[PDB]
């Protein structure tokens, strides 16, 4: 993942569709269920490298169900500091009634899962194999 296209708009610190980058801070994470970072992007354009400063930078999060389509759903942190989600999980991205997808900014986006345990799980969606990291109780 590149920080060149990563929106940093921190102040005083269901369909996904498209989200303006002026109201997001930190990386935008989406789950295929494997974690994927989406960089700041022009409206149907090349990925821009402005740290989410420019007012035309958005996050193209257009979604279809994941076996042969885009990530399940995306999660991120917005400017005020609230966890904003979209789409459907595999609230947070749940692959199991007691298991979340582990990613670098999981603790920042969901601090309630700090005492969770990390396991190496396998999830089969469609016909493709995904070896991801899971945080469970």
């Amino acid at each position, epitope marked *: 993942w590149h920080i060149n296209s990563t929106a940093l708009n921190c102040n005083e610190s269901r369909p996904c569709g498209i989200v303006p980058a002026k109201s997001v801070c930190g990386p935008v994470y989406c789950f295929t269920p494997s974690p*994927v970072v*989406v960089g700041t*992007t022009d409206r149907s354009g*090349a990925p821009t490298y402005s740290w989410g400063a420019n007012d035309t930078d958005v996050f193209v999060l257009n979604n279809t169900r994941p076996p*042969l389509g885009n990530w399940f759903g995306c999660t991120w942190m917005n400017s005020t500091g609230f966890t904003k989600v979209c789409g459907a999980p595999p609230s947070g991205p749940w692959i199991t009634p007691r298991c979340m997808v582990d990613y670098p900014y999981r603790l920042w986006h969901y601090p309630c899962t700090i005492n969770y345990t990390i396991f190496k799980v396998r999830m089969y969606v469609g016909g493709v194999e995904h070896r991801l990291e899971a945080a469970c109780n």
Partner: antibody
Amino acid sequence: LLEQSGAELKKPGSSVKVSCKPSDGTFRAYTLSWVRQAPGQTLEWMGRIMPTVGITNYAQKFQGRVTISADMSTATAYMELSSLRSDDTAIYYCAKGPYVGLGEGFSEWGQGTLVTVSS
Amino acid sequence: ELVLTQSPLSLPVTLGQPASISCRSTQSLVYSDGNTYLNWFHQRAGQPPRRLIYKVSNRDSGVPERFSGSGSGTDFTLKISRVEAEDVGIYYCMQGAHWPPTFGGGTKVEINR
């Protein structure tokens, strides 16, 4: 319109790289797939790459033997097909699928690259 | 797990007459998000395929009105109202409802002048 690499002859066991360049010169929001057609066979989908985000997905047949890489600031997508075999000679197309994902098919196709394998 | 049968494989029809190509799958193509993803493609000799029908009933731009698709679930049909000399080559049905997306067997259309 989509540009594509020229025809190539690669001896068995070597690798081949096919390029796919958009006419605009800048990547956009679409999924780029690679579909080949063997002589006397139906169209066979090989792999898909989302160049805006960098997600790759290959078919189970070519797993571990094909790799699709896209370079930014160059407007080119490459398909590294290693460990070639006499049955792998075909016409390789690069097709533009919607960023939404495959399913609706491909709007634009490549001109077709004929890769021949022979000693 | 899943396969598509394209019938008939060779459909010779006279000029200016209807012609239908059936495409049958084994599973339902309704998918999760409720949109049936089946596509039809036209390929000429020496040219790459171009899309004519991006959804079972949706017509793509730059395509004459003489084309239309039908069906739901497993059975599908690509019907041509008036066959012209332009409509020659191989026709494929592509399904994007179950991984991996495979193409049809191919239907070569021949004129009977």
